[PDB]
Amino acid sequence: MRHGDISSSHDTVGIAVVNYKMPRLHTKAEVIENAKKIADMVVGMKQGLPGMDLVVFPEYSTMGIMYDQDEMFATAASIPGEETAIFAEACKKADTWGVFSLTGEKHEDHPNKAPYNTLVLINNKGEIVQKYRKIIPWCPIDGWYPGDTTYVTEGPKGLKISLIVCDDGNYPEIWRDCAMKGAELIVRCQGYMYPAKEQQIMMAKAMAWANNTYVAVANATGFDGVYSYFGHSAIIGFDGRTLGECGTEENGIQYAEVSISQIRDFRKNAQSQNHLFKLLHRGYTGLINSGEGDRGVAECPFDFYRTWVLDAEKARENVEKITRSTVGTAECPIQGIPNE
Amino acid sequence: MRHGDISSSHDTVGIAVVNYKMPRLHTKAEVIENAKKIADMVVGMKQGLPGMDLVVFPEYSTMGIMYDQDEMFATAASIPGEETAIFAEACKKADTWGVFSLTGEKHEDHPNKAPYNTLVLINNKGEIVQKYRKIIPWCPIDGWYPGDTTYVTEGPKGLKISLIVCDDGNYPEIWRDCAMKGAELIVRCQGYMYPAKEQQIMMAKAMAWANNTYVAVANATGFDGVYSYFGHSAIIGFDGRTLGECGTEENGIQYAEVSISQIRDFRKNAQSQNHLFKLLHRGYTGLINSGEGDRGVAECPFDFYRTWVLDAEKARENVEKITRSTVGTAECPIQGIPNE
Amino acid sequence: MRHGDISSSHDTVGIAVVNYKMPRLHTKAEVIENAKKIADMVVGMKQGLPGMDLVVFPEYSTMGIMYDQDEMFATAASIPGEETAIFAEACKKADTWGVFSLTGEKHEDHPNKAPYNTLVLINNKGEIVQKYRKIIPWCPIDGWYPGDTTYVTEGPKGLKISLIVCDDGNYPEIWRDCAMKGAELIVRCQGYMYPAKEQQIMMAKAMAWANNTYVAVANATGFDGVYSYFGHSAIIGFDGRTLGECGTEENGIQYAEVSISQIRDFRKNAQSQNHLFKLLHRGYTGLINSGEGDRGVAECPFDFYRTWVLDAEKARENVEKITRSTVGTAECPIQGIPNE
Amino acid sequence: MRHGDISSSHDTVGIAVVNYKMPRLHTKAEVIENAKKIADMVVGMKQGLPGMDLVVFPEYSTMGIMYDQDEMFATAASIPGEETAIFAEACKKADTWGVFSLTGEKHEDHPNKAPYNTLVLINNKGEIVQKYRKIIPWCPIDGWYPGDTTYVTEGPKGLKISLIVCDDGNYPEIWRDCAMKGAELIVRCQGYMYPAKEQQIMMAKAMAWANNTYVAVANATGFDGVYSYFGHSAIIGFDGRTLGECGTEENGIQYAEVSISQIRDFRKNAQSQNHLFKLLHRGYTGLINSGEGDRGVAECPFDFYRTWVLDAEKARENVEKITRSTVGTAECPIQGIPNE
Amino acid sequence: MRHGDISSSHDTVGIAVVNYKMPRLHTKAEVIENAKKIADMVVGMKQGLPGMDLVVFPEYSTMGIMYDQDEMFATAASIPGEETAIFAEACKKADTWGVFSLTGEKHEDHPNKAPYNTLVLINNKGEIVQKYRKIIPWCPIDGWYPGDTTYVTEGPKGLKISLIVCDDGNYPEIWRDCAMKGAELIVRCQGYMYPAKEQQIMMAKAMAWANNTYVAVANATGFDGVYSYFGHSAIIGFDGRTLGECGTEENGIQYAEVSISQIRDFRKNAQSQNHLFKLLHRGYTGLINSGEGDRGVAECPFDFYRTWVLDAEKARENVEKITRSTVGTAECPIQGIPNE
Amino acid sequence: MRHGDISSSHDTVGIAVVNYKMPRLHTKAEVIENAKKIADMVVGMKQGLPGMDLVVFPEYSTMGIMYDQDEMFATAASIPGEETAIFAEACKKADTWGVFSLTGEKHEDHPNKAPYNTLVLINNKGEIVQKYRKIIPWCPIDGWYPGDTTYVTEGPKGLKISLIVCDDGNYPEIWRDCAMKGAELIVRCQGYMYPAKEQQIMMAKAMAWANNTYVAVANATGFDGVYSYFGHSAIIGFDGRTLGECGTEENGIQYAEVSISQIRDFRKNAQSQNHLFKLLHRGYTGLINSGEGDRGVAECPFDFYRTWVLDAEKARENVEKITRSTVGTAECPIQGIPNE
């Protein structure tokens, strides 16, 4: 957990995050050409950052956002496929792990259902070791089919990694789920457009803190014809302090060293802010002092979560009363999104 | 949702938060005397802030922290009781609602079990309308008996309020639970000691954002013989932007106007960052476009929460593998807290 | 007055501001081609920002700065003209109002007097509804002929709008004049070059506060051969708090929702910081308490303004004694600017 | 214009500003005792700050705010009087000029009209050389009788000084009036209560910039039974950059050196941001290039100011249409302030 | 190197720094009474911070500044002495190491020469293990006799510590000297008065970075009759990032965990910003590639340092030509300080 | 020492710094073409900044970084040479001094030893008046041959200038050496890549403060195939306060006026923070008061510097014990850099 050098040690994973300029592409050939640009960038970055063990690219960095539906379907990727092969060669040549974005990934019922929005973690041998599909698409605009699963994978030097995508990160639940499955690093890849710049910078730091986890964010930059992407790729310590952060600049990079021993030492020995431990051992001191044994309380005291788990339809009904009943609003209509 | 004036309108609740200097008290008479000081402060503040509809004091502001166990038991309060009567008179005289802290509140089995750490919301008629007991004591140091329930209550001008206490707020789950029960304002009262100043300032803003809720924080200040409390009481908009924030100064105040119509208009008409709605309607655009109807997906996709709800003991076992098995650590022992 | 979403409601005007990269152009055909690029950008932005009701481009965004005098005269625009027609079509297609810059606008005595530097507000029907000519050119470098008039126009959803241009905004008087004519939003379009970045970010916020008005700033970016433009386009609430702000990045965008009901509720019900009201009712409490009736004092107590209005030549003489008598200084001469 | 040392030179005025803890007093004897505390503080500060030439105390620092009307009248001061004599002795002993606050100063019709709220500038010989009465009381709460006049006085080392008080500074007009009368330093003394902390920090910097003037702010601190005062006393350069700023701490001090030659050199030789000059020479380059002579335009182009000067009642009527017609609002009533 | 918890582990030293309110004392008995207050504070802090291994108090925290020369001599301490015995008992009772300030420490020729300004490091057994005398008194005001020696001592958990005092830290040379002697933590104790707040916050961070060392700063707070002390006690990582920082509040505390293994791993394995290594191996890559062996260049290339070491009088003469020849300046005279 | 205008006076040097986009070049012809682009930029900037007296470009701005060794040798420059002639013509045409970067400059034994990394200061007559070779290459990656000498040269308006390059500035010793040779402005030209953005922004400010010197930084921007350069070119006052700073944007510019009389007045008359004077007059007050004469102590009290000067090999041995013995580390190997 230290910032400023280009090296890394046996104890630290050298993580680079890339403020990749958002492409605006239309064809499969254009997508392959840009994949090769990303590969070239990986290899060059390693020459400058000899400690680099993990390189992270934004959501949409391979395809850009395929606004045209026909082009979306025509460029949707297979995984493994040609794009991932190009990335895997770069990971081998640069002796690094990497996180890359396939937007779309063909649905099992392609082309008759929307593609997924997917990340892969590729190891330094070129092997795909995690494939994560966006659980929370950025609706209404995002038309991707939602995924359903989070994963944790042993990463470089044994650092445990989970992947999440852009809007996912507004929801504390996903960060919690990953950490509670053992993640030590949560990687948030995004094409996060203005407006919500300051809110997203803050969310990543808050979630690092709340889940006692390292966080790496790679966010797109530039204007793509529709959106301007605000950058601020970052690496954040498990104590909530930023390691390094980019600005809004195109093809900014940040690089930091995250210590394997430090996060493990914290998770064993931290007390007042060992959030993962404490959530499942509530009130341990008071129960001990009250003659009630020495584990605190584990039971979930939050009705929302009990209802959501038992009766998701009821939870949905409840929130519709607080918000609205239809996915659209007639005060700001959007074609294809129903309203009242 | 606007900052800088002392007025309030039919549409806005005028909220004041107080950086109350932490008392260091020992006797019931001292506690009553300080309760009367708080009452006097309420009445004076109203003369300066004619728009004030809600005034919020920190956790521990009535008793301070009763480090001595005998004094803790001797000063534990009944609710309603003498202290709350003193506060209620101030609320009536100043025509304001108020949030006050009773630390301890006698356990049902007092003095044979630890007191609760409790907040009350008192209306402008002097009536106690919410009583909240800290669900997440700040263990290991906090010896209070844990509460088990969150509440939402109709507040001034109909603004819906939930109360939470200090360490509670490190856990996104509580903020979510309150918002999903309909809270429009979450009030976090705390005696939040150094070290974790910047992390706590950030958490409140992140939770305002994540839950699309107003947030008011009242934090203690000063040194009490054990801890220094960092202040930074604040009022935060549902868009994640601070309204006003105190520094670390003793008896700082902040005051802001929170619009009832704005939060309700947002919750009806916001789309991309309508987090409450979107969590229970995932992927609506993609499902519509895929021929699958128009509600998105409600089901909880996060195994942590399903396991915690079904099998809290298993969730506890799982987190112990990531952290430690005992509530204490032998590398930093604390009397009364068992370790390996 | 809220930030982070892409929607807007019946109560809010969705405002986008654009960090438009400064063109460096030479011919009429180049200017038309870039006008069409701006039009395309409007239409694309609306696809990403369904709540957008007003889009704002910087000063010089259509022509760039025509440093060559012959090219300045050759490219000076008519209003209405070809450029405004191109913009108007975009406003209709995207169902948005827009603010665009014509630099120059032909003088009535063109080509025998310097062009004006002009902004237009175009409604969602394509109609030009305000045309504002820069009252305060950025002399010495700016050679535009000064305008003489501020305007207020009913905007989207009835939000009252005034336009100002770049250096205008250093002078509090213009902001006051617009607000006192009823403006609810003051739009400052600029090609504000380094050096004065931080000062300009601060001025816009201070003027929002001082005049209890929403403020939208669109500032250019990039290097144009002479100047680097610092961006930091922004939308600011009437309470002085930024809604959203860009960095220095080329073609950054910010987007915020400004509530019509909130500014009107403030202006009716704010008291201590109702600056517009209070300036014309000074000392009302003291006069009431002194037996002098209930309106305070309206009379202007500031001799500068009385002298400037009565005897502008005298005010000019007075300031020349404090500064210098000639428009130029011999310590830093500029061709065409006389000095002593 | 430089910060960090305790010295001063023939070219620099050493200015100290004091975050004076707000007194809460009731009697004339208490006021005299606190005046002597201020005197003692001046003398001690000079021993630590050998360059100090000017020391500035907040509004209300001598009396505090006399909330009780009888005590207000009983403690209202004569100027010169006993309090000013005590201050003058300190100025002589410490060989410094000083700015002190008399709240109230007896009205000419005392006790039958409200006192003024007054500042004095006392030279290093003990002589009162400026007496300024608050033109803009902080209504509704402030009950002081409004003053009507700004002044400029030759200060230490010949630095020209104007005094203003607290709410005055929200109105750009007063800062302009002082600068246009020749002020080189505008001193803003205040008891500026929360809420509006960040807005007031920004206003002082913006006004330094807009008027090309040094600014010194002395603001109270602490809680006085009604208000908490936010400190952030400061000294700001004529380029808008803070020299030094206090936090919210009681009896904080800041100290900076302001160069006489630098402000005069700027006002002679600055061009693009010579705001005082440029306001009365608008469009000089364009007029020269248009064959219209070499002074630009002096005439006031802002109808608000012409109307306010000609017909203050009309300006008042106009603003009442934008805001409200009565000094009070029935949505937030205040005793003694009429509403509809 | 992590912030937010109250624990510490075998790998981390828990460091607390104290924003101790500056005393204003006159007698030996008063000094002893305040020493006992510091002792009590240590013991209480340990009850709240079970990980605390090192507690650091400001310069002057025991005596305050003895402005009266007779009182300075009368209260000058012996080391070891009564004050250090009181501190040592607290260190034993709280099982912590501590850094305390004796101002003055009797000169060997007491009372015929000025006292030293001294820090002690006391271990958890009560033993004084470092005694450091201020090498750079804060002249002109500081009248202490200068010390001449820096030290490094094995600290808690083996962390190597050096002590420095207040003005020392403006001079990069001292930080370098300590680090090059092996310090892993440099403790800067200070009574750093306004004005230079922001400069001192920055210097400590810059020196942590430049010397690849942890830094702990304890700074006084409050007003003592002469000076206001700005606080901002802090703990900073060897990567230049703050761990935790206080504000200006009286008796603020910060607490952070500094990892022994992390600093040692950095100093072994960092490359681009291994400043200690690189200063003595300049240009190693270029020399290797040029056929010149594999150590880079060690020789000092900076004439200032060669001259200062060889011929301090010449270095002094040289700087007098750049600055002034006498310790005083006639433009800002100070009694006892000669000028021209 | 003032920021915001485009003018300059007889007392101020107008300094512009350029965030020059990093080239990625391969041939001599490409280098010449880019040199001509820099020349054109100088001339254009002067048209916008009539006060400009000094323009500063980053390290590598002429060649970029020649990663390919053959291309490095093929493009290494002579000084004077063709590139410097192109720059000199721009300096004459724009009537400005300039700082430009030649990377490489042929070694005396070219092509058999690595080139130097060199800066030139060119006056407004086109004459090269300083040539500085990087003393501290950014090893391990930087393969340039180290220089050995710092210089001070009379600059525009007589401002004394020293040049340093990028990694040099991490070492306080170089800044001290330049200031002690009489520098009034230290110019740091750099191609400073991410990661260490915030650390480098802080170092320049800290060194301005520590050495009581103006500082100008020109840093590259953009991505060059290997590195992303973070910009934040800046001009900083001798009091440690930034004048103006760029962001990360390509071809950003900052411009500030630095007063010759102010730095000289400070260096004569500052007392508490006259660091240059005080380092060679330690403890003057205490020695005077102790009967020991009136100059303080000049002798160097820091063993590191005495050892480094006397016995650089010993100093090297000492630091190797603290860090490592070989220039490389086997935990992060780099081809060509030996390790254990």
Nearest C-alpha in E relative to B68: E47
Angle at F49 between CA F46 and CA F55, to 5 degrees: 60
Q: How far apart are CA A231 and CA A248, in angstroms?
A: 4
* Inter-axis angle of helices A303-310 and A312-322, nearest 10: 130
The count of other CB atoms within 10 Å of the CB of residue C290 is: 18
C13 within 8 A of C158, measured Cβ to Cβ:
no
Sign of torsion, CA D1 D3 D8 D9? negative
Per-residue burial over A223-258, b = 16 or more CB atoms within 10 Å of its CB, e = otherwise: bbbbbbbbbbbbbbbbbbbbbbbbbbbbbbbbbbbb
CA-to-CA dists, residue E237 to E59, F58, F319, angstroms: 22, 29, 20
Using CB atoms, which residue from F67, F225, F332 is nearest to A50?
F332
DSSP designation for B4: S
Q: Which two tokens stand for residue D187?
A: 């001193």
Residues 6+ apart with CB under 8 A from A10: A157, F331
Q: Which two tokens stand for residue F52?
A: 């400009």
Across the interface, of F271, F290, F298, the residue whose CB is closest to E114 is F290
- F317 labelled catalytic: no
Q: Do E244 and B194 touch (CB under 8 A)?
A: yes
F293 close contact with E: CB closer than 8 A: no
Q: Do chains F and E touch (3 or more CB pairs under 8 A)?
A: yes
- Minimal CA–CA distance to E169: which of E143, E132, E221, E115? E132
The interaxial angle of helices F172-180 and E172-180, nearest 10 deg, is: 140
A221 and A19 in contact (C-beta within 8 Å)? yes
Of chain D, the end-to-end C-alpha distance in Å amounts to: 51
Name which of B6, B11, B271 is nearest C272 (Cβ-Cβ): B6
Task: Select from F4, F270, F273 the Cβ nearest to the Cβ of D273.
Answer: F4
Q: What method was applied to determine this entry?
A: X-ray
Strand pairing category for D234-236 and D242-245: antiparallel
Q: Are A213 and A161 in contact (CB under 8 A)?
A: no
Q: Which chains are within 8 Å of E by 3+ CB pairs?
A: A, B, D, F
State the residue for tokens 């002092």. Answer: A289
Cβ atoms of residues D7 and E324 within 8 Å = no
Which of 3.40.50.300, 1.10.230.10, 3.90.79.10, 3.60.110.10 would CATH assign to domain C1-340? 3.60.110.10
The CA distances from residue C185 to A23, B132, D162, E250, in Å, are: 35, 43, 33, 44
| The A128-133 sheet, strands edge to edge | A128-133, A116-122, A97-105, A52-56, A12-18, A253-259
Neighbour-count burial for C236-272, b at 16+ CB within 10 Å, e otherwise = bbbbbbbbbbbbbbbbbbbbbbbbbbbbebbbebbbb
Cβ B19 vs Cβ D231: under 8 Å: no
Best mutation target, D6, D157, D245, D259, to test chain E (most E CBs within 10 A): D6
3-class DSSP assignment, residue B88: helix
- Residue whose entry in the numeric block shows the structure tokens 């510019």: F253
B129: enclosing H helix or E strand:
strand B128-133
CB D304 within 8 A of CB C176: yes
Whole-angstrom Cα distance, residue C319 to residue E211?
Answer: 53
Distance from CA of D125 to the nearest CA of C (A): 28
The CA distance from B12 to B27, in Å, is 40
- The 3-state DSSP class for residue F215 equals strand
Q: A184: how many CB neighbours lie within 10 A of its CB?
A: 25
Total residue length of chain B: 340
Sign of torsion over alpha carbons E300, E305, E311, E314? positive
Residue of C nearest to F47 (CA): C226
Amino acid at A143: G
If you ran DSSP here, which 8-state letter would residue A233 be given? -
Residue D151 has phi, psi (to 5 degrees) of -135, 155
Close Cβ partners of B293 (under 8 Å, ≥ 6 residues apart): B287
Encoding tokens for residue E113?
A: 């020469």
Please indicate if any CB of chain B lies within 8 Å of the CB of C7: yes
**Annotation says F166 is catalytic:** yes
Domain ranges of chain E: 1-340
CA atoms of B226 and F134, how far apart (whole Å): 53
The first and second tokens of residue A294, run together, are 């020495």
* D7:E199 CB<8 A: no
Q: Which of C48, C50, C251 is opposite residue A193, by nearest beta carbon?
A: C48
Interchain CB distance below 8 Å, A331 and C50? no
Rounded to whole angstroms, how far apart are CA atoms E84 and E77?
9
> For residue A119, what are its two tokens?
């990340």
Nearest-angstrom CA–CA distance, A54 and A15: 5
Active-site residue A249, yes or no? no
Rama region for B292: left / alpha / beta (φ>0; ψ in -120 to 50; rest)? alpha
Question: For residues B323 and B331, what is the distance between their CA atoms, to the nearest angstrom?
Answer: 14
For D277, the token pair is 């000059």
Alpha-carbon distance E265 to A11, whole Å?
A: 8
B228 beta partners? B223
Q: Is the peptide bond before E338 cis (omega within 30 degrees of 0)?
A: no
Q: How is residue F257 written in tokens?
A: 């006026």
CB F98 within 8 A of CB F42: yes
As a whole number of angstroms, the distance between CA D325 and CA D337 comes to: 13
- Nearest residue to A216 (alpha-carbon basis) of A238, A233, A229: A233
Cβ contact F319:E279 at 8 Å: yes
CA distance F237 to F215: 7
Cα–Cα distance, F2 to D270 (Å, whole number): 10
Q: Which of F235, F209, F236 is nearest to E172 (CA)?
A: F209
> Which residue numbers of C are catalytic?
59, 134, 166
**Amino acid of residue D112:** N
> E-contacting residues of B 246-285, CB under 8 Å?
247-250
Q: Using CA atoms, how far apart are residues A118 and E149, in angstroms rounded to an integer?
A: 61
Omega before A111 within 30 of 0, i.e. cis = yes
Q: Which residue of chain A comes nearest to F230, CA vs CA?
A: A252
The whole-angstrom separation of Cα C77 and Cα C86 is 13
As a three-state string, the secondary structure of B226-244 is CCEEECCCEEECCCCCEEE
Torsion D123-D125-D126-D130 (CA) sign = negative
Mutation to test the D interface, candidates B15, B246, B249, B260, most D Cβ within 10 Å: B249
- What resolution (Å)? 1.1
**In terms of Cα–Cα distance, which of C49, C176, C164, C156 is closest to C117?**
C164
Residue D268 three-state SS = helix
Return the H-helix or E-strand segment holding C203: helix C197-211
- What's the rounded Cα separation, in Å, for the pair E224 and C50? 60
Residue F128, judged by CB atoms within 10 A of its CB (0-12, 13-18, 19+), counts as middle
The Cα D77–Cα D63 span in angstroms is 10
DSSP reduced 3-state for D210: helix
